[PDB]
Symmetry: D2
Subunit: 247 residues, 4 copies
């Protein structure tokens, strides 16, 4: 079995494939653009991916990798009543370039199922796009589309640290996204079955994507403080994983 693993407690420019407004500055992974004062700017799109590709499944041996990612993100909107849009962990084709800004998070083109994207993502959405989004703040699981196949309720705490964990288990095809605001003691969890072999190609890049809305007033940051990742392609420990990274 092949392995690949890495833990960032601070972010470095030199080991990431940066795309658009996503830039590293003072340890933090600022995916969107903040003005001189620090106040977030509208119409921003950023993408950041890990330097080495990851094989998530094999064509010949028919085996599927199990993986896990953990990171702490912080969305800071000056006015909670008008923010946009969100941030997402994404597994994306290796030489793949950004898509639609705004409520498409720079990952998808449309709401209808277009497998040509070959994109799985877990979205953390602050802005309710009636076009596809559910009633309130949610954690979505995105497969080829920005219309999330399964979402969960989210108490978005403004400018407060969110620790996340995402795990894929090959033996059950299950995907689990969890989120905690330690400062507020609020916890959340979504779970869904996903076939990686039908969605993503054998080799994918791994990282983040985040955007701000269309309207000028509708501003928020999209900051990731730390990031840990592990993958195991069989030919995946959880207890010994989040302690070298998260804990």
């Amino acid at each position: 079995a092949n392995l690949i693993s890495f833990t960032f407690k601070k972010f470095n420019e030199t080991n990431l494939i940066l795309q658009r407004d996503a830039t590293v500055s003072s340890g933090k992974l600022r995916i969107t653009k903040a003005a001189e004062n620090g106040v977030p700017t509208a119409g921003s799109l950023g993408r950041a991916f890990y330097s080495t590709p990851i094989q998530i499944w094999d064509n010949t041996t028919g085996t599927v990798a199990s993986w896990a990612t953990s990171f702490t993100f912080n969305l800071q909107a000056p006015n909670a009543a008008s923010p946009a849009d969100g941030l997402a962990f994404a597994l994306v084709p290796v030489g793949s370039q950004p898509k639609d800004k705004g409520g498409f998070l720079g990952l998808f083109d449309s709401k209808n199922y277009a497998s040509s994207n070959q994109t799985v993502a877990v979205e953390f959405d602050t802005f309710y796009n009636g076009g596809w989004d559910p009633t309130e703040r949610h954690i979505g699981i995105d497969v080829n589309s920005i219309k999330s196949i399964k979402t969960t309720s989210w108490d978005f705490a403004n400018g407060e640290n969110a620790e996340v964990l995402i795990t894929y288990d090959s033996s059950t095809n299950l995907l689990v996204a969890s989120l905690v605001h330690p400062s507020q003691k609020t916890s959340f969890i979504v779970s869904e079955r996903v076939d990686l072999t039908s969605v993503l190609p054998e080799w994918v890049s791994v990282g983040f994507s985040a955007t701000t809305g269309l309207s000028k007033g509708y501003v928020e940051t999209n900051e990731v403080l730390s990031w840990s990742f592990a993958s195991k392609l069989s030919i995946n420990k959880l207890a010994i994983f989040n302690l070298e990274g998260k804990a």
Copy 2:
């Protein structure tokens, strides 16, 4: 920083400390009694712990260990209307002995804050005891008492597998327990800020504890299929990604 880590994919008698009705069979950790026909028995009590005690907070340096457990359990009852009582993952003192069966899960004495017990547990409750319990089947966090300081809705699936992840973070003091029934794709989480120094002793036995009800009819299985655990005590002043792939997935 000191480290401890193990991943049972199948339970073995040889590297656990079994108390009461707890018994290892065909790789399962059956913590409550089952008849010859494979039928859950009433009035049962079990306990299974790890063979090394664990330092969770160091008095001299005031440091606190960050730790993570993951395990798959399975509770099968014949009659959903009358089951009892549930299983629990707990951190007990080094040389701890079992306590009250039934609605106490062999871990606690009374509903009031009894600091003399020194026990932190994450329960998985099936039987509702009005006196202390909430309405529906719940995940509960037990500190020095059976009356959980926080609870949440857990939609108990009968005879189904439940993958469980429980993490304590030292820098945030936050204990987070999360459950998934992969057959149903249903997920359940509860998190509460807990201070270990105030509650638990320096060294602790990490493991399981489970019970059945007062009456004949109130029977269920209290079984653990597999188990992973890791800990990290910082010497001067814990990955969640590489932990559950060596164990859970």
Copy 3:
């Protein structure tokens, strides 16, 4: 696959099975005796082991585990010309009791092969015993016998830290023991073929064994500063020594 791992950067009494003169003081494992002024005492016999037993091979599946261990030890004799005897890493049966003192290190009865012991050990030899030992100080692989099946030259520097790495890989049945004295930038290594199914039982205790001599002058300290250990029992692969040695000390 099944997994067990721990890192001792500082030792503690409670997660250790201690036998005879073996003691733990201020974060150090003093396997042999010491005075209050700091003088090694003769006729000392120490053995310390990890609490949780370890399945090294599984009868039914016919699989043999692959394990690695890395530790730091210091051997300080007052008079270097007359030292005795040395320490050893040893895989011993779970209920085993310390054996013959002196150059037998507490692990064997005779120089001739006797399978009733069921013991694999890697010895670090300061005192050359004419009957079995080769001339110079050595690292020896001991199979049920105090006479090593293979040895290699060792420049034992008195009172210095010695980082050791012992690795067993089942796919080639190869045990590789290596020692570095980082103070004088010296390095030594030994390798031989060993079948664990024959020599050792299924479950074992893993730890240390050290002794002092017979004479009032043949004394040395036998101390272990830090200790790492990991093992992997497969269901139906080599051990990652790259990620281990860093996730060790």
Copy 4:
């Protein structure tokens, strides 16, 4: 602390930087040329490196990273009496290019110390150069030059697998490089004190480098069958146990 780890048990083109004759076929990283029929070729040079750079020391906090690497290689010659030249594990500048072929192993320019290369390499030497090498096959710690700052006798076993472990402990500045031949139960070890801060840049690429001789007759294969590497860089001021099993 910051961590990076991986474990190739079969090589893939998709997550490596390949240079010159270096090639991946059927999961075995072949560094130098081998003919269709399996015949090794002279005048070859290969280099393979991991896709992510690795921070071995941080300037701002003075923190230096401990690391470890394990890989199994096989060298096979038609004629053991005349092979060339060898292969080497190296920590290399973030965008470096292959240097002198042949006796220099595609890594160095000359026998004298030139810290412009910024290259720590552990070499595995088949061909004794009467210019800088000891009189036999050797493992050698190379620093900014092809002539080793320390060596040890290696009993090169023709067409036999060789497991290698290289470990750098930053709490002792000690680099230890070993090699075992599992088919013949033989082992070899070298250990020298190397200060990375005066040798290598903050960020380095991590990988392999090999060559064959100038003469046509002097042929061998330079193959790596598996690979593991781990690193740990702290914020302030490495378990070989868990690594070596969690490795290959």
